Structure formats: structure tokens, C-alpha cells
Amino acid sequence: IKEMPQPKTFGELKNLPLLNTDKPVQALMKIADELGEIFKFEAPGRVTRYLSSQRLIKEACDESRFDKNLSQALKFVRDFAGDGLFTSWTHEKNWKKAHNILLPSFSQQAMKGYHAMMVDIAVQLVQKWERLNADEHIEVPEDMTRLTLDTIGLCGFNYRFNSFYRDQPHPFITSMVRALDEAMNKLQRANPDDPAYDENKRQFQEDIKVMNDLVDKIIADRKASGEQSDDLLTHMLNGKDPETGEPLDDENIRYQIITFLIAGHETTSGLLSFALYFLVKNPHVLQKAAEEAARVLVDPVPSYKQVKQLKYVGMVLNEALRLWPTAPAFSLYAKEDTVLGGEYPLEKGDELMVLIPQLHRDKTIWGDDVEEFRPERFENPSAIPQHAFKPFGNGQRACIGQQFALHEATLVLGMMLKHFDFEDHTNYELDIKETLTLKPEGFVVKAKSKKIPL
Ligand code: HEM
Numbered sequence: 001i002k003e004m005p006q007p008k009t010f011g012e013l014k015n016l017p018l019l020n021t022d023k024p025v026q027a028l029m030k031i032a033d034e035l036g037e038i039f040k041f042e043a044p045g046r047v048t049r050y051l052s053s054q055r056l057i058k059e060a061c062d063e064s065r066f067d068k069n070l071s072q073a074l075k076f077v078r079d080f081a082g083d084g085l086f087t088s089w090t091h092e093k094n095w096k097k098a099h100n101i102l103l104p105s106f107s108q109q110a111m112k113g114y115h116a117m118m119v120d121i122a123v124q125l126v127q128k129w130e131r132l133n134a135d136e137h138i139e140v141p142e143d144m145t146r147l148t149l150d151t152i153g154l155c156g157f158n159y160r161f162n163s164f165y166r167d168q169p170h171p172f173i174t175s176m177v178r179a180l181d182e183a184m185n186k187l188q189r190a191n192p193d194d195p196a197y198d199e200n201k202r203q204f205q206e207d208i209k210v211m212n213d214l215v216d217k218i219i220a221d222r223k224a225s226g227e228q229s230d231d232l233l234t235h236m237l238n239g240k241d242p243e244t245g246e247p248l249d250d251e252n253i254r255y256q257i258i259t260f261l262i263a264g265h266e267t268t269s270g271l272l273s274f275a276l277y278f279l280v281k282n283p284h285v286l287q288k289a290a291e292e293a294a295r296v297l298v299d300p301v302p303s304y305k306q307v308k309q310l311k312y313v314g315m316v317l318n319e320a321l322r323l324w325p326t327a328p329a330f331s332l333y334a335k336e337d338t339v340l341g342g343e344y345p346l347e348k349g350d351e352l353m354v355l356i357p358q359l360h361r362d363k364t365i366w367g368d369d370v371e372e373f374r375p376e377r378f379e380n381p382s383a384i385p386q387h388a389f390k391p392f393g394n395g396q397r398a399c400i401g402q403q404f405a406l407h408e409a410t411l412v413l414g415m416m417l418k419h420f421d422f423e424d425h426t427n428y429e430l431d432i433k434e435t436l437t438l439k440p441e442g443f444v445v446k447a448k449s450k451k452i453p454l
């Protein structure tokens with residue numbers, strides 16, 4: 001048994017001021033590069049251990065020994081996402097109940113039903129870029145977020161945010177982004193009771209009110225209708241849990257919709273943004289992915305079956321997820337006293353944080369070239385060891401949206417590569433903005449149309 005290292009301390013504040021930065025995940029990555037596969041992080045009244053090696057992460061991903069923890073970040077998001085799937089404990093009745101009801105709606109099979117709605121929004125993105133003037137550029141994360149929000153609104157509850165018709169976000173989105181900003185900011189606060197934070201806390205309560213009032217209104221309007229579209233809202237209003245035999249109540253449905261809207265906005269848009277960044281920085285890879293898009297997507301409207309054929313586009317997406325997993329951390333707690341890695345004794349209730357970007361840089365798994373963008377790493381899926389690659393988290397608490405996000409991302413990236421050539425006209429310097437998720441801030445390109453009809 002060894003003592004684990006710990007980064008620099010600030011007297012009574014222990015390690016907390018290390019998070020007083022707009023880029024805390026990148027700060028922890030640098031600390032993991034300095035200290036290795038595990039380090040202790042202490043705040044007043046809180047300890048956790050940050051894991052970076054596949055060797056220790058594979059044990060942490062043992063569901064007999066560790067369960068999902070709500071990190072302080074997730075506890076703050078729980079104030080508006082409630083006992084939705086993402087911010088519920090595994091042992092809350094509503095976790096398993098929602099999981100059983102929603103799993104069939106998120107299966108690879110269910111994507112056949114969502115495809116047409118995804119195509120509707122993808123075509124709006126292509127038409128936006130087709131309509132830019134010669135002197136204009138693309139704001140990549142801004143347009144990817146317009147797309148992913150609209151896709152989940154239309155597949156989520158047959159609601160059009162119409163993001164490609166606006167500069168100013170939909171009211172719900174203003175409240176949701178500001179609520180997320182508050183929850184991630186609260187984490188850092190030396191002194192949270194400080195009066196400088198009074199306006200933030202008043203605002204926070206106001207935004208919770210906006211999100212609930214508006215989602216409850218869609219639920220209530222849909223019950224009034226009788227209308228039965230093929231969206232998640234229908235499946236949740238009709239579905240019964242086979243275990244309890246109960247449907248979700250309206251309050252929990254509202255938490256599920258807020259939860260799905262957070263995911264659309266934050267994660268899939270990050271992935272598409274990083275994928276396009278790595279493609280314009282790696283022209284040989286861009287050529288191989290655009291060859292596939294041009295050969296496979298032979299119809300003006302892509303089919304489900306054609307999107308499944310974009311294998312190299314899927315490898316590009318996996319390699320962007322390896323370098324910059326847009327949901328970069330998840331938290332676990334010890335179910336019982338146990339010994340991590342033959343060396344680090346833990347007590348029942350002790351917390352671990354999985355630092356996914358660091359896991360994805362483990363040279364003992366990936367080789368010496370870990371900073372290089374090389375989608376060929378993913379040629380043969382079965383060559384990647386268990387728990388080496390975890391952009392969608394772990395086990396029964398893994399991302400329920402994984403098939404949805406990768407279907408949307410492959411469809412959209414395929415269409416972008418078919419329809420346009422891309423220039424890195426500013427020689428963009430990567431600047432990663434941290435919200436709930438990671439996105440490349442200020443990433444812009446120019447698209448030269450290949451003039452292929454829709
Ligand atoms: C590239 C896109 C996405 C990534 C990288 C991603 C990543 C993740 C990760 C790492 C987790 C586990 C979090 C934890 O253990 O605390 C998770 C959970 C979840 N994600 Fe995603 N996600 C993505 C897209 C989506 C989408 C599109 C949806 C739904 C519309 C979604 C819904 C969820 C839900 C509901 C959970 C909670 C599942 C449960 O515990 O039962 N995600 N996601």
C-alpha cells in the first residue's frame with residue numbers, strides 16, 4: 001500500500017483554489033501529467049481521488065465494487081434536472097423506472113424512426129452554408145449547437161426551436177445556459193454565502209422557474225391534444241415500467257425532457273466541433289473521410305442504411321472523442337471497503353473521479369503517438385481493451401443517448417464532407433471552453449460548396 005500524491009495546497013482551502021479557473025478539466029489534466037495515474041484532491045469537507053490510468057479505471061468500472069456518484073457539479077445540475085436519468089442515484093426508484101421505460105426508445109433500432117427528423121435539421125444546416133456569400137465564414141460550435149438543440153427538440157417532443165431562423169436563443173435556452181453557467185461556477189467558490197453571489201442565486205431560481213413552466217406547458221398541451229407523434233414525449237406518456245408496472249409521473253417526465261435538452265445543446269455539438277477541428281488540421285484524414293462521404297451518400301437525402309456505412313466517419317468521431325471527450329469526467333463511490341490497484345485502500349462511500357481525457361492518453365494502451373489524430377486506431381474495434389475508451393461513461397449508468405448522438409454526428413459530418421470543402425482560413429489556435437462540456441471556442445472555417453444538389 002502506497003501514499004497517493006496531492007497537488008499544491010492553499011492552507012485551510014486545501015486544493016479548492018486549483019478549480020478557480022475558467023478551464024478546470026484542463027488544469028486537472030496538467031496535474032495528472034505531473035502526478036501520474038492517481039492523486040488526492042481535498043476541499044473543505046470533501047475529498048476525492050482523480051484516476052488517469054486504464055489499470056485503475058478498469059477496476060473503478062467494476063459495478064460490483066463502485067456505483068455512479070453525483071459529483072458536486074451534478075448535485076448543482078440536479079437543482080434543475082431533478083431525478084431525471086442523468087442526476088438520479090442508481091438506488092432512487094425513478095432511476096430504474098425511467099431506464100426500463102426509455103431504453104427501447106434509444107436503441108440502435110429506434111434510430112430508424114428518428115432518422116427523418118435528424119435529416120430535416122441536417123438539411124437546414126447544409127442550406128445555411130450553401131447560402132453564405134463568398135466573403136463569409138462559419139462559426140462552427142455556434143452552428144453545431146443550433147443543429148443538436150433542434151434535433152433533440154424535434155425527436156424529443158416534436159418541438160421546433162427554429163435555431164437557424166434566429167440570432168437570439170429561444171427563452172428556455174437562455175435560462176438553461178445561464179443555469180448551467182451558475183452550477184459550474186458554484187464549484188469554484190472560496191465563499192459561496194458571499195453577497196456578490198446574491199444576484200446569481202436570485203437569477204438561478206428564476207431560470208429553474210422558466211425551464212419548468214415551459215416544459216410543464218408542453219407536457220400539459222400534449223395531454224390536452226391526444227396527439228401521438230413518434231417522439232420521446234409520446235413514449236414517456238404511454239410507456240409502463242415492466243418491473244413496477246407504473247408509467248413516469250408528469251414531474252419526472254419534465255426532468256427527463258430538461259435532461260435531454262441539456263445533452264443535445266452540450267455534448268453532441270462539442271463532438272461535431274472537435275471532429276471538424278481535427279479534420280481541417282489533418283488534411284490526409286479529411287480526404288479519406290470526404291472520399292467515403294462522396295462514395296456512400298449517393299442520394300440527395302441520406303438513408304439510415306447509408307449512415308451505417310460511413311465507417312471511417314465513425315472512426316473520425318471516435319478519435320475526436322478519444323482526444324477531447326466532450327463530457328470529460330464522471331464520478332464513482334465505493335459500495336464497500338475495497339483496495340484499488342492492490343495499493344490504495346478505500347472505505348465504503350469514498351469518491352473517485354475518472355479523468356476521461358487522461359485515460360484516453362494512457363501510452364501503455366495507445367502507444368507513444370497519443371496526441372496524434374489517427375482515426376486508423378479504431379479500424380478494428382476489438383483491438384481496444386475493455387475500459388480503455390469511455391467517452392459515454394460506464395455500465396448501467398453509461399450514456400443512454402450514445403446511439404442517438406453517434407447517428408446524428410455520423411449523418412451530419414457525412415453530409416458536411418459530401419457538400420463542402422473546408423478551409424482553416426484563420427489557422428485557428430485550439431481554445432477549449434468548459435461549461436458542463438468541452439467545446440472549441442472561436443473555431444471558424446470557410447466552406448467552398450461542391451455544388452451538389454439536395
Ligand atoms: C457525444 C455526445 C454525448 C456524450 C459524449 C455523452 C456522454 C455521457 C456520459 C459520459 C454519461 C455518463 C455520465 C456519468 O456517469 O455521470 C452520459 C449519461 C447520459 N447521457 Fe449522454 N452523452 C452524449 C449525448 C447524449 C444525448 C444525445 C442524450 C439524450 C438526448 C444523452 C443522455 C444522457 C443521459 C440521460 C444520461 C444518464 C443515463 C443514466 O444514468 O441512466 N447523452 N452521457
Ligand SMILES: CCCCCCC(=O)N1CCC[C@H]1C(=O)N[C@@H](Cc1ccccc1)C(=O)O
Nearest residue numbers: 024025043046071072073187327328329353436
Ligand atoms: C457528464 C459531464 C459532466 C462533467 C461535470 C463537470 C465535472 O465533472 N467537472 C467540472 C470541473 C472539473 C470536473 C470535476 O472534477 N468536478 C468535480 C470538482 C470538485 C469540486 C469540489 C471538490 C472536489 C472536486 C465535482 O464536480 O465534484
